[PDB]
Amino acid sequence: LSSITSGASSNPLAKLDAALADVDTLRSSLGAVQNRFDSVISNLGTTVTN
């Protein structure tokens, strides 16, 4: 059954590159949000003390 083939793709490497680009974009944004979040812990601790 494995000889039944549809068409071959066109320029597969470009599509793979595009996929990798979407992924790393998202990971970058997540790292940014973490960097935001830490400062708030520090700030709130100081304000509570005062």
DSSP 1-50: -TT---PPPS-HHHHHHHHHHHHHHHHHHHHHHHHHHHHHHHHHHHHHH-
9 binds other proteins (CB under 8 A): no
CB 28 within 8 A of CB 22: no
35 binds other proteins (CB under 8 A): no
11 binds other proteins (CB under 8 A): yes
18 binds other proteins (CB under 8 A): no
Which lies closer to other proteins via its Cβ, residue 13 or residue 26? 13
Which residues of this chain interact with other proteins, rule CB under 8 A?
11, 13-14
